[PDB]
Ligand binder design. Structure first.
Ligand code: HEM
Ligand code: HEM
Ligand code: HEM
Ligand code: HEM
Ligand code: HEM
Lengths: 306, 305, 306, 305, 306, 305
């Protein structure tokens, strides 16, 4: 192979998501940083082994790709597509670079973020900064276990990493991000049985509701899709809660990785636009998307060589 | 008698500091919450034993004290006193309640803060909310180990908890908070040897500089105070870094507990106003205080009733 | 002076409860063992320090007391008082000796139990043996967090240990054990909101229900008692799940320590016989007591000197 | 093809559940087999990564024929009784095996509860054992147990069906026997005598040298080389269990191998002896009270049902 | 109390023992260091809390005490007394200062030792340096669990700390050190049953041999001594293995603390000189003492204020 | 082909043992080599999983010739002395290397004891070092040590012999050098000067930028690009050691590579210098007192003797 970035990371309990745009003239500064970001990851992380588990995944948007590089583009790379649904909208917001920084402790994330933004001062404009924290039993802001059906091992490699279909960019992946805010008051007004019907799984035990009872507009129903192959289409997610109690913000930061954006984009269409049997994903009646961006996360080797 | 709040907490790596003012008419909602805050601490924390190490310490300001209660006031409770130094200023900012929430993980802090603010929606106005994280070798935002000379065990009990000198309020303590922002660019322009001269200890090994070489305007020099009998006056600190990379905010949230505010206030006067030997604490040449408040943290029993 | 047993133990995640009767002629063998039980706890436990957290608490029943010792009896010691409620029955079952063994691992518990019983074979007859385990995040078999409102530190010392009121036995405590079996099918038939009404706290978050809403026949309602003093009366509980899936046994092993049995017995009367405003504790509609015994757990120095 | 979790990390707790399928139970069983992987995830995922919950499902010979039609695994037959001059290996009923392992008992128990909940009415329990690791991987006779198990690629090659039965590649054969030990007898031997029974040193777990290791020692009789001269290996995960009230001290034996021929050879040598050894001396202190053989299919085989 | 030094330490798995003599003219350097040793302990240790468990206990010998201080002497302070037995001899070797440094990791021990010896360069001459490590189940070099019968809690405070019998020096203790080397070949030639008869406990299970079978010349027999009341006289031990495989050195570094040396010295006389019943402690047939020193470890306050 | 445990997890304790084979000792050493894997398991198994005990056994050039029938690994020769204008890399005797690592020194010692137990009489100790990692991966000079080692596939490729010497695939080449430091001298430097010697920042471990990194910095000289254009990498596991009484503060260097050409190049650069650098400045505070090269065979090689 070539070495991929740390897309398949161990379970980590803290994250920083940084989205920036590249200012006029910024391209050179950015190119230098990209070639050093792996060694900054080691500088910050190595001394905190082995509990640290610090990783940084760097992604580049469609328009930024063309400013930074010439030659081939990854096959799937385009701007995030707005979805204007009957009721709900998936918005598009600007973002040229993504840093998805993960570790077992927030401070490690922050130390690496500090170093990266230190090198980019003057070249970039911050668009989003989120400090995420996992709840102690892998629960999210809605109180459900979040992560359970993610693929693992070889299945994950198959679902997430670009291969032979675009061989110049093998080891890469496509990341979609959306920042969601929740109406927790509304959510907390449902009974548990009602909430389970929205998600499609049991709250306490995390056992999937049987097909005979799981609503067609439940989240798990609409995000299960089968390919042309008859095989299930999979993504790798690492959703993180965030918020502020003083400003009444409670949020889920969605990030989904896939070997092609077509998979992630299909799931999004089903959620926002609905199907024959479902107006839309019921989870969107409690969750509003306020950002939306798409990035390509190259193989590690690609970045080293600049 | 009394169970104190969890003022002497184990080392914890995450904190939420929440400072609020009480709206007119809010007093009753607040009173109910104060009587329940211990049981919220257990509800959220008990199931995360024993790694969770969740605690909440609740403090009440001088003006709010008068709105909430009648009868005795704690002897030492007054508003934070501004210090207008020749060069540096310690400001005073509004705050009626303090929640000092600590645990081994941020999410536990957040869950408890959510519960508290949920019960207070409509009664209070948030003034400050800070999510702190300790760096992995007890270092602070300036890269120095932070906490080393805090008292422990019986020395800490003696330094922090109100006793027989104000017996109605035994088990209590006085908390001073200041939010500091640092000029990291300036700081990182000093050599390590220069930084050590600012703090008064060695950066990598955390060994105190010897008396013959420690500057008089170093931080450790100015915050060492001896009482009339010649014994050292101590406080208990739990400084936490915080920040945002995007907005270039790099901060230290200072919190100091003491059995009387006179100790904390003296150290502050020495830092801001100087001594014969020292114009001011050199650490203030890299650190600006943007909040300042004083609270009394009652014994736990006091709140139960 | 006196050093209590390890009644106030840290949280431990395994236990063995062993209840035996003394055969005729067994008294001398039991007396020798009682003087050695602390040294066996060291023999087994010391090598697994400090993770091990092995503790054995030894309790003696009312009629056993008279066969083993002459001199003073602890003031509160009598047989367990059977409760014959309108609906639900707290039975009293034989028990001369209790060994309440706790540790962070079952094998340490088992090792100690093996050594104790090895010395006592010939002289005792086992009546009950339960291997208990912690379930998830301090949850019991009904899926609720169990322990939350126990007292801690000074408050626990005062609620549990005999003092000046019985000075010959200061450092002692009274233990009540009852093995409960649950009807899981019935219980799972309830909505979560209905279950929360039975217990009197929220299931997921373990927040207590407000006075505004807490039923009077909720468990938390009936087991809250304020003394003549105006102060609450507290016990220390360390309930352990146990069971067998093949036999459909799902259980809670209740053990509660108190400085006098009057406290424990009142809570039991409220639960089984009811109050002015509540027939009986609704928890008993899904929980059957099949054992019941009371024991005195002497101070450690009492046992040493035999 | 993805195998089941036969090669598991070291785990300190286990539940072994053996059941028979009632008449008419076959359809309920087939549904459960297709869901058992997702129950494993539901129960286990929230305790990652310390949980290490795994369930291996095995199917007996007669049950295989009730549940499926067409080709059978080449090696699948009922456990063969061994009627030795002194010691006997009995065969007991069992159609399905759930070998559930984790770092904590409660994860095992939660998964067993879910499985048996789906099978209520279709199956009858024959055996349920809750096993625990004892100290430092010791068994109930006080010896370290596991030391010579194969690891990594050697283990993959010893336990997984391959080319020799390609329709069932990814599978394995599990033999289970529940043993009870006569501890009184055992503890009457000196340590040196016990070492001669096992074939290794008690405290250090170093193998006895070939010049002193008896031919009727356990390690001697269970070391078997093929005609090509290579060692024939199995993967074991013996677990202690017991009840102190009943004076029951046991070892639950489970051995996995790519063909039952390997496991069965070792068994014949233990029970029936060799030219130079009447039987395995360990059987003078260990009685088998169960005996069953199961085929543990590749994971994909179960998914597609 | 006055604050004692960390004589009662948790179980720690690494130690450095440093014994030095003070050169002529060294006295002042030494006095400065003694007043700073607690703050060096915090500097080195604080950043590794709470896994670190670094402690240093500082002791002063008889002749050094007179060079360093005027005022009272601790009542019990004298040079270690050589014991010239019929077969075995307890030697006395020079030592003015003892640093007993303990932590969960060797590097913390070493960092503190480096700081201390750095301040004393020029003033002192090293006599003994041992780096000790605990075997993984609290076993010593002879393969027995070592530490089992040590006192804990209040019993330990009573056994080790000076009180009202020498009130000027309350909070202090007396440390005896001896470095032993073992004849492992001889030892390994005994059966386990024979080794158990030497020590007086069971090897694998660490259960004491019963009084009716424990030999009078076993180690546990000769180091059990009762005071006038018939109460056991106890010390606190923290023996540490050490060794060098290339030089065939396998050793136990003995350190025992007591409130008066009379107790420790009694046990030593019994071991080396024997009694009416026992020629000498059989453990000495496999263990040779090559050092011997006695130190007083003052209360921490005493060192602060010089 | 199964390698030894060259690529180990991070371990915080080590023993390095170097011996020579006495005349006539060769049969004894051959026996031990065939058992050393089973001794690693005897001692380590019971301490799973925290123990992480591993033993890597290396054989020198002249020992190879005395011990083995046929072909030699391509790269095996005696360590070549380097006689630089200022600093000298000495070559010292050593036939056998045991590189023992674990999370705790007692496991290391136990295994070392057992090995030397079998070898007493047949070998002569030349060096024995008990190493321990500082609490944040620091070496005796106070710098983080290990940061740029390769990982995973990159490491597998830089360390393990492949098809270029197919009889010995799975093997590796180890160079050891024991270094003693002049701490007094080194502590005389400012932090900025020390950073110039190493080529990275002290506290943060960030590499100095190319326009500030000296050419005689350690990181500068031990960066080597092949004829390939690609970086040439070794795998290091340097361990501090020492004795405070004797004023010895040391770094035990061990580097593995798939050919010694890589390690030897870096050594020439350090000791003999380049176009723009007299020698590695680190050698101005570090004296090598040993030097040997060994071949560490595949595990399978040793098993079959
Ligand atoms: C708005 C906040 C979101 C929350 C709180 C959330 C939460 C959840 C939860 C609780 C599950 C069930 C457990 C699990 O398998 O992780 C789940 C499954 C999943 N979610 Fe989401 N989700 C969100 C948004 C999204 C989006 C935007 C997508 C796709 C673009 C997505 C894709 C999935 C997928 C594919 C599954 C698994 C389906 C399967 O079971 O086979 N999620 N999510
Ligand atoms: C089936 C047997 C039992 C189960 C499963 C059970 C479970 C629980 C649960 C879930 C709670 C709420 C959380 C907490 O521990 O504070 C609780 C509280 C309590 N239980 Fe029980 N319990 C049982 C039997 C008993 C018995 C037999 C007694 C007394 C004799 C008792 C006394 C208490 C007390 C005093 C409280 C706390 C009330 C307060 O909030 O002040 N329990 N129990
Ligand atoms: C009856 C209870 C059993 C006990 C307590 C027991 C115990 C042990 C112990 C202590 C060892 C040595 C350490 C090790 O390598 O794990 C061992 C090795 C072994 N046992 Fe058993 N065992 C039992 C039954 C069985 C059975 C029924 C079989 C095979 C059918 C078996 C096969 C093996 C094998 C293959 C080895 C490794 C031999 C080698 O060193 O190459 N065991 N057992
Ligand atoms: C080679 C030196 C030594 C070794 C290897 C050794 C080893 C042991 C062992 C294995 C035990 C039994 C377990 C325990 O309670 O710790 C023990 C007990 C004891 N040792 Fe030693 N020991 C040594 C030297 C000494 C010396 C020199 C003394 C006293 C001056 C001493 C005093 C004791 C005492 C007081 C006990 C406990 C007695 C009681 O059981 O009530 N030891 N030692
Ligand atoms: C006194 C002996 C030594 C000390 C104290 C020492 C210390 C260090 C330190 C602090 C680093 C920087 C952090 C890192 O990347 O690990 C480093 C890097 C390195 N050292 Fe050394 N080192 C020593 C000897 C050697 C020797 C003898 C070699 C080679 C023969 C060597 C090869 C390397 C290599 C290859 C690197 C990384 C180069 C890169 O940055 O790409 N070291 N060493």
């Amino acid at each position: 192979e070539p070495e991929p970035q740390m897309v398949l990371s161990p379970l980590t309990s803290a994250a920083i998501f940084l989205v920036v745009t590249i200012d006029s003239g910024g391209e050179d500064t950015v190119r230098d940083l990209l070639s050093d970001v792996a060694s900054l990851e080691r500088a910050v992380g190595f001394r905190a082994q082995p509990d640290g588990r610090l990783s940084c995944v760097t992604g580049i948007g469609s328009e930024a790709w063309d400013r930074l590089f010439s030659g081939a583009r990854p096959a799937g790379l385009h701007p995030f597509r707005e979805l204007d649904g009957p009721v709900h909208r998936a918005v598009a917001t600007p973002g040229d670079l993504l840093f998805h920084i993960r570790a077992s402790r927030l401070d490690l994330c922050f130390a690496l973020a500090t170093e990266i933004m230190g090198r980019l001062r003057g070249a970039v404009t911050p668009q989003d900064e989120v400090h995420g924290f996992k709840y102690f039993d892998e629960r999210d802001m809605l109180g459900f276990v979040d992560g359970t059906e993610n693929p693992t091992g070889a299945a994950a490699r198959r679902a997430v990493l670009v291969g032979a279909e675009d061989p110049a960019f093998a080891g890469g992946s496509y990341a979609v991000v959306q920042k969601y805010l929740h109406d927790i008051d509304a959510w907390e007004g449902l009974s548990v049985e009602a909430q389970e019907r929205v998600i499609g799984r049991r709250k306490m035990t995390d056992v999937e509701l049987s097909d005979d009872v799981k609503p067609a507009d439940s989240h798990v129903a609409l995000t299960s899709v089968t390919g042309p192959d008859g095989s299930d289409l999979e993504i790798l997610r690492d959703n993180m809660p965030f918020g502020s109690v003083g400003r009444e913000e409670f949020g889920t930061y969605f990030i989904g990785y896939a070997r092609t954006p077509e998979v992630t984009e299909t799931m999004l269409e089903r959620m926002f636009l609905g199907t024959a049997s479902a107006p839309h994903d019921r989870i969107l009646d409690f969750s509003t998307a306020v950002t939306g961006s798409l990035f390509f996360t190259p193989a590690a080797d690609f970045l080293e060589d600049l």
